[PDB]
Amino acid sequence: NLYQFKNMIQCTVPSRSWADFADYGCYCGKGGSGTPVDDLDRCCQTHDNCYNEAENISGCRPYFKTYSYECTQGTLTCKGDNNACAASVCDCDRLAAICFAGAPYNDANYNIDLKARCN
Amino acid sequence: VAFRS
Ligand SMILES: [Ca+2]
Structure with a gap:
């Protein structure tokens, strides 16, 4: 879920x-x-697409589904007790978090005008 | 459309 x-x-x-x-x-x-504006934005596009896929699973709601995962000692893991929906969503989140960590952050790309620039 | 990070 989004909290996780x-x-x-x-x-x-x-x-x-x-x-x-x-x-x-x-x-x-x-x-x-x-058009994704940079590498970090591309991380998010992959993540958005990954949620759209997970939504194809019957009763699977990415924003709200609680999955099982661990974050310790520099390592992020999705655990084995996840059902198909939980496992997919956990993986989408995990991959995005790792992607975010290796992508440059450009303050200029924060809070841009979606209507004018994301057509 | 809700959030991130
Ligand atoms: Ca989005």
Whole structure:
């Protein structure tokens, strides 16, 4: 769920607030359209697409499904007791959190005008 | 459309 995804980010990017990723580029946060503006935005596009796929699973709601995972000693893991929906969503989140950690953050791309620039 | 990070 979104609370858990926030914690994943806090565990892989303890250097910045999670809010920095909540409204960035064309894909991070609300936006789900147009040309990804940079590497970090591409991380979010993959994540958005990954949720759309998970939603194909009967009764699977990515924002709300509680999965089982661990974040310790520099390692993020989705545990074995996840059902198909939990496992998929956990993986989407995990991969995005790792992606965020290796992507440059451009303050210029925070809070951009979605209507004008993400067409 | 809700959030991230
Ligand atoms: Ca989005």
